[PDB]
Coordinates of C-alpha atoms and ligand atoms in Angstrom, one line a residue:
Chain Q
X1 CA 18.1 -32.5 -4.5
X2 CA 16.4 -29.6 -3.5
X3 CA 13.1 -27.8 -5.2
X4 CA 13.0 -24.0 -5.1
X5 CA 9.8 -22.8 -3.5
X6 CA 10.4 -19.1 -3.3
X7 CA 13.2 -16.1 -2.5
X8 CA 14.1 -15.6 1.5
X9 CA 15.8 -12.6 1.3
X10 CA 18.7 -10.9 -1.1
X11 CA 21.2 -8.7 0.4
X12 CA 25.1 -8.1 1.4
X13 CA 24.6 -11.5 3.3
X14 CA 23.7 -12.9 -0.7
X15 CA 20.8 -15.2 -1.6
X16 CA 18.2 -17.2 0.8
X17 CA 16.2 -19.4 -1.2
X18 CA 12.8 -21.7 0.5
X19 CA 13.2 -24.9 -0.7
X20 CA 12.5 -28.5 -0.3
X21 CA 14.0 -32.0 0.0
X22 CA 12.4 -33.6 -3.2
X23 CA 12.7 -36.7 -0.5
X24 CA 11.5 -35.7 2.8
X25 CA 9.6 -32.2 1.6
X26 CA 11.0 -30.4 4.6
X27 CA 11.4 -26.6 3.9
X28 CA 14.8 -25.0 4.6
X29 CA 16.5 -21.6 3.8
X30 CA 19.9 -22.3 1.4
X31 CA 22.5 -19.5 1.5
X32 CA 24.9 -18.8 -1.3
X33 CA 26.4 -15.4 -2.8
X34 CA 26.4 -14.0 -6.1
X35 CA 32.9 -12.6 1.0
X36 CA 32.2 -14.5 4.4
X37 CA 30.0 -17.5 4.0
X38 CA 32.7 -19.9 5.3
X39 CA 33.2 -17.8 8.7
X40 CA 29.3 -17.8 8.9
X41 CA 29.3 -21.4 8.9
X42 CA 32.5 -21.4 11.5
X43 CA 30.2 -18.9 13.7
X44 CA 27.5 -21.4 13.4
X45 CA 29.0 -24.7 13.8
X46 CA 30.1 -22.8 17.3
X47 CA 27.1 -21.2 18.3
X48 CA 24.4 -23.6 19.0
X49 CA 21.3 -22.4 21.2
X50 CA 17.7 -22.5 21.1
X51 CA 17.3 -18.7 20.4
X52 CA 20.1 -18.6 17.2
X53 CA 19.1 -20.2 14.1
X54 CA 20.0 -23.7 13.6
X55 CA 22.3 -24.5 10.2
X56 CA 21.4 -27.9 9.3
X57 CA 23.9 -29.0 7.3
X58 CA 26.4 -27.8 4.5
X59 CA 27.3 -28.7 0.7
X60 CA 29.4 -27.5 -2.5
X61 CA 29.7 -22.9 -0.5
X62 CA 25.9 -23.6 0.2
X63 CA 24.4 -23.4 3.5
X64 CA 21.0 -25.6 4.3
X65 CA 19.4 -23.8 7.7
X66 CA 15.7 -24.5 9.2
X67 CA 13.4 -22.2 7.8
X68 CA 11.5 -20.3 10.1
X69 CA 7.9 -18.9 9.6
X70 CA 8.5 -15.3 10.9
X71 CA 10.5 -12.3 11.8
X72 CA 9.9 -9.9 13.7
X73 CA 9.8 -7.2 11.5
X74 CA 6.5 -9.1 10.1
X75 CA 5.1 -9.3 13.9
X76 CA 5.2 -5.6 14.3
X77 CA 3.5 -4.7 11.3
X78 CA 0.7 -7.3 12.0
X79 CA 0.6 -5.0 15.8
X80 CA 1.6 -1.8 14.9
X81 CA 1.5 -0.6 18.7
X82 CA 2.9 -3.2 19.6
X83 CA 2.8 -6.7 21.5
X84 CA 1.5 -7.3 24.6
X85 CA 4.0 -6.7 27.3
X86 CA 4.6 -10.2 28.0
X87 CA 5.0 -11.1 24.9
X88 CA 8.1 -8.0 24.8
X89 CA 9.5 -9.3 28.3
X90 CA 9.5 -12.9 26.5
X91 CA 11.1 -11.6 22.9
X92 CA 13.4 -9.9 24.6
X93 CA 14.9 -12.8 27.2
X94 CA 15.5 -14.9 24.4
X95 CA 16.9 -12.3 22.5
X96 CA 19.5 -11.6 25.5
X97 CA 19.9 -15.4 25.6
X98 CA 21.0 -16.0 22.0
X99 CA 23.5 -12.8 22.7
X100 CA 24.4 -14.0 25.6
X101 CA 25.9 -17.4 23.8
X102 CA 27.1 -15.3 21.5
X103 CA 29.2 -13.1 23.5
X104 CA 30.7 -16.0 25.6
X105 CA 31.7 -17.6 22.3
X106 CA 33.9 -14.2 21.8
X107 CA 31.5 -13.8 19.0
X108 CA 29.5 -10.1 18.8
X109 CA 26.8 -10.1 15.9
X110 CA 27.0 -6.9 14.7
X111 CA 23.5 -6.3 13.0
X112 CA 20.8 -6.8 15.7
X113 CA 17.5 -6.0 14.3
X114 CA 13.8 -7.2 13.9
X115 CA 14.2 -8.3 9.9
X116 CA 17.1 -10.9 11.8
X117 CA 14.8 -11.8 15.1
X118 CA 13.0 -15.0 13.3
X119 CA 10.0 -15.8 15.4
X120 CA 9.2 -19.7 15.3
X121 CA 5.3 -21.1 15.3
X122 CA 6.1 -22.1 18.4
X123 CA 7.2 -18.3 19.7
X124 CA 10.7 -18.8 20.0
X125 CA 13.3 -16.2 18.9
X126 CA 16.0 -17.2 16.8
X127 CA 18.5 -14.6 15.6
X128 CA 20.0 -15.0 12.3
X129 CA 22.2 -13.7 9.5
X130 CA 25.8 -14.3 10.8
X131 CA 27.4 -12.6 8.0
X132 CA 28.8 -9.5 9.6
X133 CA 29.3 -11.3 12.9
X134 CA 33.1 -11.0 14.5
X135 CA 35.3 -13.2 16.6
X136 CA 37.1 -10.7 19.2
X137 CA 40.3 -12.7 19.0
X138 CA 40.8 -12.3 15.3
X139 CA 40.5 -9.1 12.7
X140 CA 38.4 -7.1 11.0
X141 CA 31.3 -6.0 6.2
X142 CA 27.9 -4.0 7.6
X143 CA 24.5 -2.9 6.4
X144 CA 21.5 -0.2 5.0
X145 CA 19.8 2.4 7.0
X146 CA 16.9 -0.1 9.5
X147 CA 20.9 -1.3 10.4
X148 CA 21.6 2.0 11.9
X149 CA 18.3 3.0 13.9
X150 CA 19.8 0.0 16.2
X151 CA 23.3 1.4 16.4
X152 CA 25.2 3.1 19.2
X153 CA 25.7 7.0 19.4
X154 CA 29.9 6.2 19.8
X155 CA 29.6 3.6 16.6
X156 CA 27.6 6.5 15.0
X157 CA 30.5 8.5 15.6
X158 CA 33.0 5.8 14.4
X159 CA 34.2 3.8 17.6
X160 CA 35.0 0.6 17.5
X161 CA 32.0 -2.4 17.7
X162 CA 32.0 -4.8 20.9
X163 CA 29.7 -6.2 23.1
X164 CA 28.5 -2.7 24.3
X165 CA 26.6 -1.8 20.8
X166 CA 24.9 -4.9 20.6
X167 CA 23.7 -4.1 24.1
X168 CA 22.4 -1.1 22.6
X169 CA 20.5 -2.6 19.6
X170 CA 18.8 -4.9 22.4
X171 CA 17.3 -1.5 24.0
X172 CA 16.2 -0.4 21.1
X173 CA 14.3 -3.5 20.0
X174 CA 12.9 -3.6 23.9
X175 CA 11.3 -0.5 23.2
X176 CA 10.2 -1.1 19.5
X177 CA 8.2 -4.3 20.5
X178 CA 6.7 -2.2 23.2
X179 CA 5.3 0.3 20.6
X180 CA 5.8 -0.6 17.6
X181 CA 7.8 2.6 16.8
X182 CA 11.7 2.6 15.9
X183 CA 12.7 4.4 18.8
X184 CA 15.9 6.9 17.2
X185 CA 14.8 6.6 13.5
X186 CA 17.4 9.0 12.0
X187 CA 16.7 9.9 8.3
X188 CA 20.7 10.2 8.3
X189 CA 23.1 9.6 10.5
X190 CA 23.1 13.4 12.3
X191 CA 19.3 13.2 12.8
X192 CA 19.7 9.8 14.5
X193 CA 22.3 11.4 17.2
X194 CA 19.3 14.6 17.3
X195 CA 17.1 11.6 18.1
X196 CA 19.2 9.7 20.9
X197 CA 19.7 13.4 22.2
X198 CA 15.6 14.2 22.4
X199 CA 14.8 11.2 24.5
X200 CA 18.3 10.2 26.5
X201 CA 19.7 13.8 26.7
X202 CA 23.4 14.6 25.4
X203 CA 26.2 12.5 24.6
X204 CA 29.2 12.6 26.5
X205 CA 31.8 14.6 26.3
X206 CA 34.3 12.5 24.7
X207 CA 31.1 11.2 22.1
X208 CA 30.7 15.2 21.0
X209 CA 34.4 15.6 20.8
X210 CA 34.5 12.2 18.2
X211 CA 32.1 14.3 16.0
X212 CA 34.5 17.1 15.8
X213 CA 37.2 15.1 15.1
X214 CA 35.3 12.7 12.6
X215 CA 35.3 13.6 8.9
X216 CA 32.4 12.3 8.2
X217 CA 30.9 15.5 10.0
X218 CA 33.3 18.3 9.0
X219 CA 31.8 21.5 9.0
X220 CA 28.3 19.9 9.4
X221 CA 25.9 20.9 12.3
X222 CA 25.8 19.4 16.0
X223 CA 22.2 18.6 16.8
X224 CA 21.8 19.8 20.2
X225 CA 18.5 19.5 22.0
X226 CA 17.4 21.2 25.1
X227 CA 15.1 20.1 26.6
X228 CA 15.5 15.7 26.7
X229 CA 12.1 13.7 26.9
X230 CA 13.2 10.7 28.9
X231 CA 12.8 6.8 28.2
X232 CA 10.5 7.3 31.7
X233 CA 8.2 10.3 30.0
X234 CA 8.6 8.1 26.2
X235 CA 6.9 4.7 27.7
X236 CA 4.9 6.3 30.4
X237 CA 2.0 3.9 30.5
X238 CA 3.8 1.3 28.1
X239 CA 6.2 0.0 29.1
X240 CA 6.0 -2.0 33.0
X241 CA 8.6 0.1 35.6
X242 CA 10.8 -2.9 36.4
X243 CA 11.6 -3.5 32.6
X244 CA 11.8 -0.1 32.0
X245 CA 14.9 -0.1 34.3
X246 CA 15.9 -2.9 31.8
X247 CA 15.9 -0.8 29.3
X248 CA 17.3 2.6 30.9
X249 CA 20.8 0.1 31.6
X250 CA 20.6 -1.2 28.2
X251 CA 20.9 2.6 26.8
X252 CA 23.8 4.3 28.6
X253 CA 25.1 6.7 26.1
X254 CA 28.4 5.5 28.1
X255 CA 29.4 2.3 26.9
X256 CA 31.1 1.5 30.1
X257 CA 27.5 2.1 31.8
X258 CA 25.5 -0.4 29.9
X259 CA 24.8 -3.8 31.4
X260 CA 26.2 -6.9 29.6
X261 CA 24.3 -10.4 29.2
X262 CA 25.4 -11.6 32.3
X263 CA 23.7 -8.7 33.6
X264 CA 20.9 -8.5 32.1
X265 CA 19.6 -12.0 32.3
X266 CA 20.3 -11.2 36.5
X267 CA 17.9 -8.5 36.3
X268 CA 14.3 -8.3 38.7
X269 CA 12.5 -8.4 35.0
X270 CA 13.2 -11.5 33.8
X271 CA 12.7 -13.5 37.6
X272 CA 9.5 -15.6 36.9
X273 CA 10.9 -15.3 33.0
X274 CA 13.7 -17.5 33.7
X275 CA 11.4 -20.7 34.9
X276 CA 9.9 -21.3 31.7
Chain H
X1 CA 8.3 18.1 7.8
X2 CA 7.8 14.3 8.0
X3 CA 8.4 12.2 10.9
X4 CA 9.4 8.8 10.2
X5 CA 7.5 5.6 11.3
X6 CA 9.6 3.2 9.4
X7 CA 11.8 2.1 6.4
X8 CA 9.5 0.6 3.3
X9 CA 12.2 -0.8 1.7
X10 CA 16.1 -0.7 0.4
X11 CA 17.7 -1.8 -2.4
X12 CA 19.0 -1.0 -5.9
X13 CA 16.8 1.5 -6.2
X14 CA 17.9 3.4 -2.9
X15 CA 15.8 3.8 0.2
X16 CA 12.0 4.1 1.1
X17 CA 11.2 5.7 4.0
X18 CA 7.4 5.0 5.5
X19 CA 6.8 8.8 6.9
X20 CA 4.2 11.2 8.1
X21 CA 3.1 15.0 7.6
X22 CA 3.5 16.4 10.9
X23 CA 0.5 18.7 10.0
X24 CA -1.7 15.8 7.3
X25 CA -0.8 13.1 9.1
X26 CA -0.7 11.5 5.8
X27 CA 1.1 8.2 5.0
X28 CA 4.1 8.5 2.0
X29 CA 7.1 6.7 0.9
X30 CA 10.3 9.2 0.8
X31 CA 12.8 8.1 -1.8
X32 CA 16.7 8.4 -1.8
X33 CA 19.5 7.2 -2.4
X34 CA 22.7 6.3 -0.2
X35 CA 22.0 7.0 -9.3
X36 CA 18.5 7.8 -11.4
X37 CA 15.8 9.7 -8.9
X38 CA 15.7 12.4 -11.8
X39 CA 15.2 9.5 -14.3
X40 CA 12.8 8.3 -12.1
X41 CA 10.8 11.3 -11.8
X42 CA 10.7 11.9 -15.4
X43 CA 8.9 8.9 -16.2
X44 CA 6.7 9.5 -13.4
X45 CA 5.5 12.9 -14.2
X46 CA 4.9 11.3 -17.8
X47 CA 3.4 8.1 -16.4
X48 CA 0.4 8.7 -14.7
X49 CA -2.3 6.0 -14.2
X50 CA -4.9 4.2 -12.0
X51 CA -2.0 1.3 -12.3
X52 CA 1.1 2.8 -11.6
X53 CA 2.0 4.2 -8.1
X54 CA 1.3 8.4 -7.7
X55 CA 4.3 10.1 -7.4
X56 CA 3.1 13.2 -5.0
X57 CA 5.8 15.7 -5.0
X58 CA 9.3 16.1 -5.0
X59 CA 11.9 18.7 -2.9
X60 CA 16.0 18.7 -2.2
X61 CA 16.4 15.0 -4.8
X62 CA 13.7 13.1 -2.9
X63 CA 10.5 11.9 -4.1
X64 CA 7.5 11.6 -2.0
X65 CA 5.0 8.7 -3.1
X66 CA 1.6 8.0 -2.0
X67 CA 2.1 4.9 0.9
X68 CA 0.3 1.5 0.0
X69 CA -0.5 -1.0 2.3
X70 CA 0.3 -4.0 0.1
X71 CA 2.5 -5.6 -2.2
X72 CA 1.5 -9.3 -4.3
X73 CA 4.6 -10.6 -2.4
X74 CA 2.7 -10.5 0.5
X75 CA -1.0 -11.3 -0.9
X76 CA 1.0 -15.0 -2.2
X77 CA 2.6 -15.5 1.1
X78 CA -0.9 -15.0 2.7
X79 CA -2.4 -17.2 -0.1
X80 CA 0.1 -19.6 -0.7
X81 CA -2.4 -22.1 -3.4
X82 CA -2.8 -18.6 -5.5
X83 CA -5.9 -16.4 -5.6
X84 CA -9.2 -16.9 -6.8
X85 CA -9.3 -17.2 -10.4
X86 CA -11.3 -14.0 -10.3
X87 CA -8.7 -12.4 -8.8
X88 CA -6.2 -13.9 -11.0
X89 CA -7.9 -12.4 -14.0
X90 CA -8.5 -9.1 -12.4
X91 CA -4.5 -8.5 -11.4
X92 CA -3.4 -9.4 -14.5
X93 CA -5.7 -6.9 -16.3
X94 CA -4.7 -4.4 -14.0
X95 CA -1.2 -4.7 -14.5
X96 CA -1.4 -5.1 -18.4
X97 CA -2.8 -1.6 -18.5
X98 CA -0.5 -0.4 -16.5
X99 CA 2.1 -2.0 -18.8
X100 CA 0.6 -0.8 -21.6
X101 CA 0.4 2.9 -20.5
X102 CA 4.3 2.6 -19.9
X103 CA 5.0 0.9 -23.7
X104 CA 2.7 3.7 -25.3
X105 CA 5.2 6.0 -23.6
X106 CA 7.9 4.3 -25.1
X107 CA 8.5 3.0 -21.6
X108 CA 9.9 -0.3 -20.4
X109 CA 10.5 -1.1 -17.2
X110 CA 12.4 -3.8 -16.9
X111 CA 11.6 -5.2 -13.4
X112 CA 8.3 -6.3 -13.1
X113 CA 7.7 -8.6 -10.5
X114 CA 5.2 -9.3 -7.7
X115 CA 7.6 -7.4 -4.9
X116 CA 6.8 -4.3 -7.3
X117 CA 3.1 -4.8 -7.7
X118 CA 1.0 -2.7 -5.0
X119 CA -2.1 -3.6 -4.5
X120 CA -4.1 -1.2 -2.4
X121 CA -6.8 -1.2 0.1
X122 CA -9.5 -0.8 -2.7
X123 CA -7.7 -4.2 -4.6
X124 CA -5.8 -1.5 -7.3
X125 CA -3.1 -2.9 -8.4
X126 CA -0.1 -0.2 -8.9
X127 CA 3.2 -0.9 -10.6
X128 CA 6.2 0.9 -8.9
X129 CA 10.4 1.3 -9.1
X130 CA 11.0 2.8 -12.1
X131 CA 14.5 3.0 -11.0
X132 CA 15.5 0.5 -14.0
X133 CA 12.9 1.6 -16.6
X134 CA 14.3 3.3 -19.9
X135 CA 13.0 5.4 -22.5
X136 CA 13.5 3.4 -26.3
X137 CA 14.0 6.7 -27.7
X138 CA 17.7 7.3 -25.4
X139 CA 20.2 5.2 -24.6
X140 CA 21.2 2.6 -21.9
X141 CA 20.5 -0.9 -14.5
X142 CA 19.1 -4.8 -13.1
X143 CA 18.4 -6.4 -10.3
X144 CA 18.7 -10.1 -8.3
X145 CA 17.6 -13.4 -8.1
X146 CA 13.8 -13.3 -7.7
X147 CA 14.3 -10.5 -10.4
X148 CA 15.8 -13.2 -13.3
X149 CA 12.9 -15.7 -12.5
X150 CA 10.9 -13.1 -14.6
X151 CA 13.2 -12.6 -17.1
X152 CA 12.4 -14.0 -21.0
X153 CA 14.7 -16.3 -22.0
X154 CA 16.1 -14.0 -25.0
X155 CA 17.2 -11.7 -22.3
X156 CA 19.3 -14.3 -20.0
X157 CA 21.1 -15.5 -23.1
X158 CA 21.3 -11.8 -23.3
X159 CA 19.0 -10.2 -26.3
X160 CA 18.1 -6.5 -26.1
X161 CA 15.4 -5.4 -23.6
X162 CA 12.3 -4.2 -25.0
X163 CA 8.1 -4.6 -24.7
X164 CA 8.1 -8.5 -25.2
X165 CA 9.8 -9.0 -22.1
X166 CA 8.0 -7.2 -20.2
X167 CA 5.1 -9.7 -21.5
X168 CA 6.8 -12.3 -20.6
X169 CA 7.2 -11.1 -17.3
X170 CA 3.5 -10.5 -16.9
X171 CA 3.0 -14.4 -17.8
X172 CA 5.0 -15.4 -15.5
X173 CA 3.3 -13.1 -12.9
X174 CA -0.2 -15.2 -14.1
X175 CA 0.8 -18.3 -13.7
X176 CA 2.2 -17.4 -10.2
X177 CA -1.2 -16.3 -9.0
X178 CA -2.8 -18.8 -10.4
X179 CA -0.7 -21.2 -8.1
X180 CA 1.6 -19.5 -5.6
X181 CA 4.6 -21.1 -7.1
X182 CA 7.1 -19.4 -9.2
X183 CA 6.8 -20.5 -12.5
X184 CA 10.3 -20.8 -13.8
X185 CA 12.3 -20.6 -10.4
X186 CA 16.5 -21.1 -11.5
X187 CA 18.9 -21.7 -8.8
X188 CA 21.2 -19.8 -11.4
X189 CA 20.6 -18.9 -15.1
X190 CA 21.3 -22.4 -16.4
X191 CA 18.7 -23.8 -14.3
X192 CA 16.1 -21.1 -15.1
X193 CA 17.0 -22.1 -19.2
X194 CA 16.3 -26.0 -17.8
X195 CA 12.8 -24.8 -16.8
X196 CA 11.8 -22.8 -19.2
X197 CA 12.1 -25.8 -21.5
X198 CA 10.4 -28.4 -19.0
X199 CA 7.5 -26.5 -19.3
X200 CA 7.8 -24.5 -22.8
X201 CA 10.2 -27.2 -24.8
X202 CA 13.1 -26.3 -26.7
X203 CA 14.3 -22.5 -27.2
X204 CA 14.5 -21.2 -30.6
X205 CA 17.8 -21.9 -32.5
X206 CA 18.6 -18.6 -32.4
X207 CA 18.3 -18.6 -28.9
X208 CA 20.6 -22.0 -28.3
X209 CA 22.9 -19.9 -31.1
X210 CA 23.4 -17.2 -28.3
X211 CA 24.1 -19.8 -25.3
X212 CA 27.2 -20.6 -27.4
X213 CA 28.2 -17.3 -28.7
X214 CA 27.4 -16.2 -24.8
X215 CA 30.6 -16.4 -22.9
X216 CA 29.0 -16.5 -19.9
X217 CA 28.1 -20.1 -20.8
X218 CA 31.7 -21.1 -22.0
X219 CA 32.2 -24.6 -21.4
X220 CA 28.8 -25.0 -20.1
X221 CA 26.6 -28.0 -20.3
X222 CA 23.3 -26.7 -21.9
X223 CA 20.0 -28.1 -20.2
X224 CA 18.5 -29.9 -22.7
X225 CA 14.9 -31.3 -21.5
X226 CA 13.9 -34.4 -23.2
X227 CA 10.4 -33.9 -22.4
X228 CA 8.3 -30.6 -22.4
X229 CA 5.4 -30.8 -19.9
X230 CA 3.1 -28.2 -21.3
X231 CA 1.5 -25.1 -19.7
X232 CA -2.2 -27.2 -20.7
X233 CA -0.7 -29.8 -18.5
X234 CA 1.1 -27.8 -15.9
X235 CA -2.1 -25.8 -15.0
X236 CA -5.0 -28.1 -15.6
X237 CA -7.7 -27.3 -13.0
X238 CA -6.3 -23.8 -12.0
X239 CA -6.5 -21.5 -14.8
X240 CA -9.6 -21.7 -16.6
X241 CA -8.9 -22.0 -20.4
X242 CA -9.1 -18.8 -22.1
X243 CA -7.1 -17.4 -19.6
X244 CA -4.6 -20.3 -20.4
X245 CA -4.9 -18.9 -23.4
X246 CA -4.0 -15.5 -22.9
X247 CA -1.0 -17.3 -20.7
X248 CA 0.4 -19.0 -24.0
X249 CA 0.5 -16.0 -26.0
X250 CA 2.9 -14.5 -23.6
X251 CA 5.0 -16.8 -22.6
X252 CA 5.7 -17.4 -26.3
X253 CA 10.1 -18.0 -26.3
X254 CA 10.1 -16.2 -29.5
X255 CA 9.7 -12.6 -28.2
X256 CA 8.0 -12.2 -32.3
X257 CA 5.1 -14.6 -31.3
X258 CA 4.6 -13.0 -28.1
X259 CA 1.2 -10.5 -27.7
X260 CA 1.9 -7.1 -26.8
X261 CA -0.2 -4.6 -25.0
X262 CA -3.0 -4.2 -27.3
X263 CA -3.4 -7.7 -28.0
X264 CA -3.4 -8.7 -24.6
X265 CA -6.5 -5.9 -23.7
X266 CA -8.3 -7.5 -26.2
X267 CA -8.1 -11.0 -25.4
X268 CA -11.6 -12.7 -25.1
X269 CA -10.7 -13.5 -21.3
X270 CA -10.8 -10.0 -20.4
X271 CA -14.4 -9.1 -22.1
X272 CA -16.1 -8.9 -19.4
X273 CA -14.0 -7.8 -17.6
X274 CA -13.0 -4.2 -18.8
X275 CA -16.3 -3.1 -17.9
X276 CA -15.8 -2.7 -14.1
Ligands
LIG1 C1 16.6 -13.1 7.3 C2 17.8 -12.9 6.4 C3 17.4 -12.6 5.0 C4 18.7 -14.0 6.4 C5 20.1 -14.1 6.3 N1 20.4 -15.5 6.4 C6 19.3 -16.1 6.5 C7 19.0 -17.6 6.5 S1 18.3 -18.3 8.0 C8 16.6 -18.4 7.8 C9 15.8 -19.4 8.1 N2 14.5 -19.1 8.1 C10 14.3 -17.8 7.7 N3 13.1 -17.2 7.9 C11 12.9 -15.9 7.6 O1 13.7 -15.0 7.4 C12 11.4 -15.8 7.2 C13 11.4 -15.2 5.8 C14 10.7 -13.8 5.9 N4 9.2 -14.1 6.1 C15 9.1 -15.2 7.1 C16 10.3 -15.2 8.0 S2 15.7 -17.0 7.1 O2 18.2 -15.3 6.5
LIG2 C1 8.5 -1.6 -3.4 C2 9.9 -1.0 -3.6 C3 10.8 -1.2 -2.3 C4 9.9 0.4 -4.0 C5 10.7 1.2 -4.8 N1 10.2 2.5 -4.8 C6 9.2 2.5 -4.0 C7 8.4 3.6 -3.5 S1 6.6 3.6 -4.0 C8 5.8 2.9 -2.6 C9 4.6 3.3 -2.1 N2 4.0 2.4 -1.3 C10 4.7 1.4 -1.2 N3 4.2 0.2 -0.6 C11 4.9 -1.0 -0.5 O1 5.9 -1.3 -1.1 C12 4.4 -1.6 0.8 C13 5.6 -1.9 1.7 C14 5.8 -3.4 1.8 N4 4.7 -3.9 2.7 C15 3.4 -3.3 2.3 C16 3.5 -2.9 0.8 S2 6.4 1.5 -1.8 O2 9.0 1.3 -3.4

């Protein structure tokens, strides 16, 4: 017997309601809708880690998790330039962590992004909101525009999702929290791939030749830039040099270029990180 | 030309886009959708008051709103015991004006809640999303969860919309800034009829007529609470009296006995008040 405190959060994932044991007056966030809650809690019961959200228990399809204080969505706008730099090296290894556990579970998330980066009173990053995550070996929802400033040039252009794109959204939150600025904040899908273009210079090839033979963008105009500003030029003075390397491997436009977990919890960044 | 800083917001309504003049530098929200912008920007151009957000301009259709840095959302997750009673009195004042301006414009609009209520740098409140008002003089939108806990009861057993429930939705706004808590928080509609009656007692017959005539109910229990706790009761030593007044004229369940705009400006607790 629960008492409702307050609304969570409403979206395609459903309804998140605070609420309270009427017995032990702990808080937790229930999930119900009005598909997918049953593979959510599937996903969950698998993935168990210190940087994805715990799910505590479930009833009649409700899901009970730990409620968390903060996202990190509410930590940039409380540091609109964003946090300190050792605070981004440390948001960003546990993001990379939870992802990591993730991907070796088969399982890829699918909708990386600072509203589902829940930031603990102690400072530790849990990622939420399961309800568009995929198990590889199966088949087969998505999200509003935020959910596309994290995605991919090739999903953009209609690829398919794997472990690459979330790679991607992990860049693009490394360089958010270093700012405070969405990095490639597209009003529309075509002004995002002008915006990936003006800092990381053109797609490849076979990426340009997916938006001619995409649909979605007959007839409409390639945004070509000429002159590229570079991740190097954009966090000049932000961002340190040995995490901006980091980041340049976590935004090949190439899939095939961009650094996996395994990777990136190897890399010269995140060497005294590790320890603590 | 606008750059974008950030999204403000999706939904129902559409999407808000946080942007900036490249050449003001000025702050706006840029609405659109992917419908009823034009709807939207009707009442706006007709609705123009210290307590409902400036619409700036409109091009190609988007509107263009003046940016504020708050909602009441927020201001009760900062202040989770309520606001001063000062404060209390002087929101709720605000926002019955801006009510009132809307209803003298044969205006409703149908969503008031706190994630709608601006309140700016200076402490003015502003109403937004008229994205589900209507007109009384045309014909014919709704919302979620959080958006029925503000909902008269009439209207979940399904009345007509009109001014009373906006008034019952500003009652319910009181007693939540009086407090923190949501007044009448359901888990679903049935338990949102449960607590209306544990505080208010009993809905009308007519109303009880509807939850059987209703077949969304069919076959349902209805929550019958033996004992009514009382609005004296449920806020003794947080509202002072003749606001508690003013708070059981509008949360009267007959939408007849309930005070509309012109009664509520004149209530006694508000006499000092106007002046300011
Ligand atoms: C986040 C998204 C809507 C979602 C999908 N599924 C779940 C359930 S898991 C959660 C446990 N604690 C949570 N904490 C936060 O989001 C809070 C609330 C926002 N302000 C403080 C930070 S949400 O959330
Ligand atoms: C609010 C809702 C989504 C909506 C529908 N239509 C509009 C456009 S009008 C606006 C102008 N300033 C605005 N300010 C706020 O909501 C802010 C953002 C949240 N944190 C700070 C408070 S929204 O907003």
């Amino acid at each position: 017997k629960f008492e409702i405190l307050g609304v969570v959060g409403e979206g395609a994932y459903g309804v998140v309601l605070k609420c309270r044991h009427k017995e032990t007056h702990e808080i937790v966030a229930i999930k119900k809708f009005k598909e997918t809650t049953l593979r959510e809690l599937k996903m969950l019961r698998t993935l168990k880690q210190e940087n994805i959200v715990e799910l505590k228990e479930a009833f009649r399809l409700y899901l009970v998790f730990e409620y968390v204080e903060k996202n990190m969505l509410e930590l940039l706008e409380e540091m609109p330039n964003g946090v300190p730099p050792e605070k981004v090296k440390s948001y960003i290894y546990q993001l990379i962590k939870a992802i990591h556990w993730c991907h070796k579970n088969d399982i890829v998330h699918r909708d990386i992004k600072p509203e589902n980066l829940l930031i603990s009173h102690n400072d530790v990053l849990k990622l939420c909101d399961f309800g568009f995550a995929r198990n590889l070996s199966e088949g087969n929802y998505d999200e509003e525009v935020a959910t596309r400033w994290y995605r991919s040039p090739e999903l953009l252009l209609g690829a398919p999702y794997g472990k690459s794109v979330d790679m991607w959204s992990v860049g693009c939150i490394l360089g958010e929290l270093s700012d405070g600025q969405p990095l490639f904040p597209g009003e529309s899908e075509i002004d995002q791939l002008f915006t990936i273009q003006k800092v990381l210079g053109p797609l490849p090839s076979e990426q340009m030749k997916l938006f001619y033979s995409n649909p979605r963008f007959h007839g409409l105009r390639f945004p070509a830039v000429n002159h590229p500003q570079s991740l190097e030029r954009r966090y000049l003075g932000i961002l340190n040099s040995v995490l901006l390397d980091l980041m340049k491997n976590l935004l090949k436009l190439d899939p095939a270029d961009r650094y996996l977990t395994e990777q990136c919890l190897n890399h010269p960044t995140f060497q005294t990180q590790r320890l603590l």
